Each structure stands twice: as structure tokens, then as C-alpha cells.
Amino acid sequence: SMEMDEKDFAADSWSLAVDSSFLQQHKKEVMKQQDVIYELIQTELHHVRTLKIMTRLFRTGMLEELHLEPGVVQGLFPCVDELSDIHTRFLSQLLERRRQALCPGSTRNFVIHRLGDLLISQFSGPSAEQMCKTYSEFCSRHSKALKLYKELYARDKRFQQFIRKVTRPAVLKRHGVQECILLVTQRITKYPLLISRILQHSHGIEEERQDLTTALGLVKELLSNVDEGIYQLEKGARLQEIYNR
Amino acid sequence: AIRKKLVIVGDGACGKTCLLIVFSKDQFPEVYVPTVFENYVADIEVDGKQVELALWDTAGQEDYDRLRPLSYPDTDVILMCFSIDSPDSLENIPEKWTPEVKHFCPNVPIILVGNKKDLRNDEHTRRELAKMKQEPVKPEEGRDMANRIGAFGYMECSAKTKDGVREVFEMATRAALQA
Ligand SMILES: COc1ccc2[nH]ccc2n1
Ligand SMILES: COc1ccc2[nH]ccc2n1
Ligand SMILES: COc1ccc2[nH]ccc2n1
């Protein structure tokens, strides 16, 4: 993550991020809506950061420092570039919506009144097809990635030293290889929870309540399709084991 | 410090997310209670042993039978949650959550946890449940269910007041350590 965005999302809530003289100008219902929208953007910034640790710290470090067999790094980090592209673009749109809403003379005081339209755009058309295809591939390769990691850590000394070295800093405490993989798999199922709570506090404008209701429906359709398209791949699986499912 | 993995399971309104938030947070959430929990690695010292306990939530995965099991690999301890204000969350334990956890986490200790124990003496809770011919889950009903499902143990807590929260995670650490 970059310092500007980390500082903008350092507070535990929107009510603590904005100036107290700005907070006092809003109704409690607007504050509750903004606290949940702030949590969605903050968790998206963290999710994009998890993908950057996977691509830049782990993947690139293994390619430039280790002598692994070809196709081993891809097996540990399936679809990470496609996932980074999807979420970095989504994050850019959320952060631009926040930026446009800032008051002149402020870098922290804003109210986002129109999130629904951005969520419908993200969870419909080509971007939804790309998310569905990429998560169906990633989640089907999840178990294989974890097993490959465990095999490499148990049998390769240089791999163990590499992992222990790059995961040593306290800021990486929650972000080991297996932890990153599960954080990415669990991300998609956080969206309906966040969207439903934003919707609970967005009844003031009927257009907004409708847009968030449509967005919630699209996210659920996307999740149902991903869930139906998953079948765990296993290294060395035989065709007979596959067609006897 | 040895690394252990904990996963919490249970119905959507069982309070599992709130329990993980209250345990992990430095300072109780007085201004905003988060909607979701990402992960956390708690430094715990129980009975003289230091453990790094990775904490994971299954919230949002309840309707997705192929995504949800991806949370289980290499779990060392399961917290199986129900809400004391919801006798229906306790009924879903033996033939929905228990067979799933036994299948994906064989030989992993399960601690059955009754959440929201503060609502057992809440008059609004008692009036609402009485309309559907119900009452808050009794301590003996929780213990009997834990006994029936082969749980390692039975515990109660309140995320709202923090009572019993530290004890649940210290016991989970002890269960994860047993060979
Ligand atoms: C029940 O009290 C509160 C306080 C702050 C909040 N922010 C969003 C929901 C919400 N609820
Ligand atoms: C913490 O309160 C929450 C959590 C998740 C939610 N989804 C919809 C409302 C809602 N509230
Ligand atoms: C959620 O998927 C599964 C798969 C196999 C199972 N056996 C018992 C419960 C169960 N659930």
C-alpha cells in the first residue's frame, strides 16, 4: 500500500477519520452508512495489499533468488496477476469516488452518497465474467497450492530460509503464503455482508436503496456461479478418480 | 512459539464474527463494530507454553458448500458456535455442522461455545422467544449437545461484556496443543 491511502484509512471508522467539526454536521444515519462504506474500501485496500505481497514479495522473490523447477511458482500462486488487475482497478474506482467527494481544503472530509452504481458496474458485464472465471480457477487450485507449499518447505533448505527471511518482519505476521491464499479465497464472500449492512443504512434516497439491492443480487449470482464451478485439482490425480466423482 | 490454527463455525447469527473481533482487538469496539473479520495471529501463553494462534472466521460462507471447506485445511482446533438467544442455532449443530467438521477435520478437537450468554436474563429476548413457544438455551442443554456430538468441551461467553472470552481462547490453545 502507499502512504497516502494508508493514512486516509488508518482510523478504525469513518467517524474517527473525518474532522470532529465535520462529523457534527451530519445525521447519525449518514454516519452509520459512511462507517460501513469506509470499512468496504479499507478492507479492499488491505486485500489489494495481500495480492501485492503474493506477487512482489513471494512470487518475484522466488523467481529472482531460488532455483525452483518451471511451473512450481505458478502452482504456488495461481491467477495472482489477474486477481491483482481486477482488485487494483476496483480499488482505483472506490478511491476516486472518495476523492471526488472531498470538501475543498480537506484531504479527509467526504460523504459518498452514490456507491450502488459503482457496485452494479463491478458485479455486471465483462468485469463480473472475469471475476467469476478467475475465482473459479483460483479456488479450484487452492488445495494444490497449499500442498505444494508444504512439500517445498519440508524438503528444500533454501526455500525454508527464503520464507523465514521474508516473513520475519512483524508487519508480515498475518501474511504467510498459506494465510495469503485463504485471505484471497475468503474475500469474495465478504462482499454480501458489507453490501447488506450498507443497504440497511441507505433508505434515505430510493434510487440508492434500489441500486444497492441490485448490487447485492449481482454479487450473490456471481458467488453462486463460482461455488458451482469449483472442483479441487490434485497433483497426480488419475482420470478414473476424476470421472468417478 | 509453535503455530496453531483455529477456525470458528456456526450459523450466520451465532455471533462468531463479534467473538473474534472482541478477542483480537486491543481496546473494546466502542465507536464501531466491524462487519467482517479478515484474520489475526494472537500471541497466547497458556499453562507455560507460548503459541501463535491464527484465527479464522467462516462468516459469509454458510450458503457456499464448495467455497466453505477451503477454510478447513490444517485446522488444529474448531470453535463450534451457537447463540444462547437462538435455540434454532443449537438444533443445526448435530446434523449440519458436526458431520461437516468431522468429515473435513477428522480427529480435530471441537469446543461447543454458547455465545451471547448475557441475553439469558434479557426480558426483551425472553418475550420474543415466548411468542414462538421458546426460551433461551439452558446450561444443561448446551452441555448435553456438546456431550452428544463428541465435543472436547462446552463453554459459554458474552462478546458484549467480554465475560468468558479469554477463557474460550486459552482453552482452544490447550486443545490445539494436545496430541
Ligand atoms: C448501534 O450503534 C452504531 C454506531 C455506529 C455505527 N456505524 C455503523 C453502524 C453503527 N451503529
Ligand atoms: C455487525 O453488524 C452487522 C454485520 C453484518 C451485517 N449484514 C447486514 C447487516 C449487518 N450487520
Ligand atoms: C460441505 O460439503 C460436504 C462434503 C462432504 C460431507 N460429508 C459430511 C458433510 C459434508 N459436507
Curated annotation (Swiss-Prot), chain A:
Modified residues (N6-acetyllysine): K150
Record PTM text: Phosphorylated by AURKA and CDK1 during mitosis, which negatively regulates its activity. Phosphorylation by MAPK1 or MAPK3 increases nucleotide exchange activity. Phosphorylation by PAK4 releases GEF-H1 from the microtubules. Phosphorylated on serine, threonine and tyrosine residues in a RIPK2-dependent manner.
Subcellular location per the Swiss-Prot or TrEMBL entry: Cytoplasm, Cytoskeleton; Cytoplasm; Cell junction, Tight junction; Golgi apparatus
Residues covered by the DH domain: 32-229
Induction of expression: Up-regulated by bacterial peptidoglycans stimulation, such as muramyl dipeptide and in biopsies from inflamed mucosal areas of Crohn's disease patients.
Function of the molecule: Activates Rho-GTPases by promoting the exchange of GDP for GTP. May be involved in epithelial barrier permeability, cell motility and polarization, dendritic spine morphology, antigen presentation, leukemic cell differentiation, cell cycle regulation, innate immune response, and cancer. Binds Rac-GTPases, but does not seem to promote nucleotide exchange activity toward Rac-GTPases, which was uniquely reported in PubMed:9857026. May stimulate instead the cortical activity of Rac. Inactive toward CDC42, TC10, or Ras-GTPases.
Quaternary structure note: Found in a complex composed at least of ARHGEF2, NOD2 and RIPK2. Interacts with RIPK2; the interaction mediates tyrosine phosphorylation of RIPK2 by Src kinase CSK. Interacts with RIPK1 and RIPK3. Interacts with the kinases PAK4, AURKA and MAPK1. Interacts with RHOA and RAC1. Interacts with NOD1. Interacts (via the N-terminal zinc finger) with CAPN6 (via domain II). Interacts with DYNLT1.
Swiss-Prot/TrEMBL domain comment: The DH (DBL-homology) domain interacts with and promotes loading of GTP on RhoA. Promotes tyrosine phosphorylation of RIPK2.
Disease in which the protein is involved: Neurodevelopmental disorder with midbrain and hindbrain malformations: An autosomal recessive neurodevelopmental disorder characterized by intellectual disability, speech delay, mild microcephaly, midbrain-hindbrain malformations, and variable dysmorphic features.
Official protein name in the record: Rho guanine nucleotide exchange factor 2
UniProt source species: Homo sapiens
Source lineage: Eukaryota, Metazoa, Chordata, Craniata, Vertebrata
Span of the entire protein shown here: 206 to 448 of 986
From Swiss-Prot, chain B:
UniProt-reported outcome of changing T17N: Decreased Rho protein signal transduction. Decreased substrate adhesion-dependent cell spreading. Decreased stress fibers assembly. Decreased cytoplasmic microtubule organization
Mutation effect (Y32A): Abolishes interaction with DGKQ
Protein keywords: ADP-ribosylation, Cell cycle, Cell division, Cell membrane, Cell projection, Cytoplasm, Cytoskeleton, Disease variant, Ectodermal dysplasia, Glycoprotein, GTP-binding, Host-virus interaction, Hydrolase, Isopeptide bond, Lipoprotein, Magnesium, Membrane, Methylation, Nucleotide-binding, Nucleus, Phosphoprotein, Prenylation, Proto-oncogene, Ubl conjugation
Phenotype when changing K133R: Reduced FBXL19-mediated ubiquitination and subsequent degradation
Sites of (Microbial infection) ADP-ribosylasparagine modification: N39
GO CC aspect terms: apical junction complex; cell cortex; cell junction; cell periphery; cleavage furrow; cytoplasmic side of plasma membrane; cytoskeleton; cytosol
Source organism of the structure: Homo sapiens (Human)
Subunit structure: Interacts with ARHGEF28. Interacts (via GTP-bound form) with RIPOR1 (via N-terminus); this interaction links RHOA to STK24 and STK26 kinases. Interacts with RIPOR2 (via active GTP- or inactive GDP-bound forms) isoform 1 and isoform 2; these interactions are direct, block the loading of GTP to RHOA and decrease upon chemokine CCL19 stimulation in primary T lymphocytes. Binds PRKCL1, ROCK1 and ROCK2. Interacts with ARHGEF2, ARHGEF3, NET1 and RTKN. Interacts with PLCE1 and AKAP13. Interacts with DIAPH1. Interacts (in the constitutively activated, GTP-bound form) with DGKQ. (Microbial infection) Interacts with yopT from Yersinia pestis.
Entry remark concerning the domains of this protein: (Microbial infection) The basic-rich region is essential for yopT recognition and cleavage.
Location of cross-link Glycyl lysine isopeptide (Lys-Gly) (interchain with G-Cter in ubiquitin): K133
Glycosylation sites: Y32, T35
Keyword Glycoprotein: yes
EC number: 3.6.5.2
Pfam family, one: Ras
Disease: Ectodermal dysplasia with facial dysmorphism and acral, ocular, and brain anomalies: A neuroectodermal syndrome characterized by linear hypopigmentation, alopecia, apparently asymptomatic leukoencephalopathy, and facial, ocular, dental and acral anomalies. Patients show no intellectual or neurologic impairment.
Activity-regulation annotation: Regulated by guanine nucleotide exchange factors (GEFs) which promote the exchange of bound GDP for free GTP, GTPase activating proteins (GAPs) which increase the GTP hydrolysis activity and GDP dissociation inhibitors which inhibit the dissociation of the nucleotide from the GTPase. Activated by GEFs such as ARHGEF2, ARHGEF3, ARHGEF28 and BCR. Inhibited by GAPs such as ARHGAP30. Inhibited by GDP dissociation inhibitors such as ARHGDIA.
Entry-linked CDD domains: RhoA_like (cd01870)
UniProt name for this protein: Transforming protein RhoA
Membrane topology: Lipid-anchor
Similarity comment text for this entry: Belongs to the small GTPase superfamily. Rho family.
Leading EC class: hydrolase
Annotated region (Switch II region), positions in chain: 59-76
PTM info: (Microbial infection) Substrate for botulinum ADP-ribosyltransferase.
